């Protein structure tokens, strides 16, 4: 599965470099993956700053203490992503909260749960939104959407 293997890479690398504080060198320059991670860094870091309150509140509410609580995250994700509208905004918000949660997993000494968490995000993202992802040219459409430079 090309669109899954790709999503899992962008989602895995973002959550990892966010939790660590330093960038790992993803794919190849100019490709969908490279541009998608650079975009996700730009728009997603903003989402975590702008929505820090709501993110602190959802994290407390979710009360993720261990590995079990990480695995059980697929349930609330399925609930939320099977509802409302589909747009890249929601997709970037979903990945930004996963980077926020991944930072917490580090502070609570559950670093190992991060890649499993990333896996769970890709699984929910594809099972609830793949027809829309295909129709949108996947990570190429994502990149194109947040490309605001050639409008004039
Ligand atoms: C504030 C909001 C505005 C717009 C877009 C998104 C969000 C939003 C963000 C994050 C989570 C939620 C939730 C779920 C609340 C926690 O629910 C659970 C917790 C643990 C297990 C389970 C669940 C529910 C399913 C069963 C298993 C709802 C919601 O219910 O409307 N909205 C959310
Ligand atoms: C911004 C915002 C404003 C006001 C009040 C609340 C919020 C809010 C808080 C937290 C997440 C979201 C999301 C992402 C979709 C739900 O994602 C999750 C739900 C449960 C667990 C996990 C996720 C993502 C991966 C980590 C594990 C949306 C959104 O799509 O509009 N809004 C959220």
Residue numbers in the entry: 172 to 195, 198 to 325
Article sentences:
Three subsets of Bcl-2 proteins interact to determine whether cells commit to apoptosis. The BH3-only proteins then associate with anti-apoptotic Bcl-2 relatives (Mcl-1, Bcl-2, Bcl-xL, Bcl-w, Bfl-1/A1, Bcl-b) preventing their binding and inactivation of Bak and Bax (effector Bcl-2 proteins) which can then form oligomeric pores at the outer mitochondrial membrane causing cytochrome c release and caspase activation. Although the pro-survival Bcl-2 family members share several functions and structural features, the distinctive regulation of Mcl-1 makes this anti-apoptotic protein unique. Mcl-1 has attracted attention because of its established role in preventing cell death by binding and sequestering pro-apoptotic BH3 proteins, thereby mediating cancer cell survival, as well as intrinsic and acquired resistance against cytotoxic and some targeted therapies, including venetoclax.
One avenue began with analysis of a series of indole-2-carboxylic acids which have been reported by others. Investigating one such literature compound, 1, we were able to obtain a co-crystal structure in complex with Mcl-1. Surprisingly, we observed two inhibitors bound to the BH3-binding domain of Mcl-1. The first high-affinity binding (cyan molecule in Fig. 1a) overlays well with reported crystal structures, with the 2-carboxylic acid forming an ionic interaction with Arg263 of Mcl-1 (dotted line) and the naphthyl group occupying an induced-fit pocket. To our knowledge, this 2:1 stoichiometry has not been observed previously with this series of compounds and results in a conformational change in Mcl-1 protein residues (e.g., Met231 side chain and larger movement in the Leu246 to Asp256 helix) to enlarge the binding pocket and accommodate the second binding molecule. Since this larger pocket may be more druggable, we hypothesized that a new hybrid molecule able to take advantage of both binding events would have vastly improved potency compared to 1 or 2 (Mcl-1 TR-FRET IC50s = 1.1 and 0.29 µM, respectively). Given the short distance between these molecules, we reasoned that a two-atom linker would be appropriate to link the two monomers. Application of structure-based drug design to a new binding mode of a known inhibitor scaffold bound to Mcl-1 led to identification of an induced-fit pocket in Mcl-1.
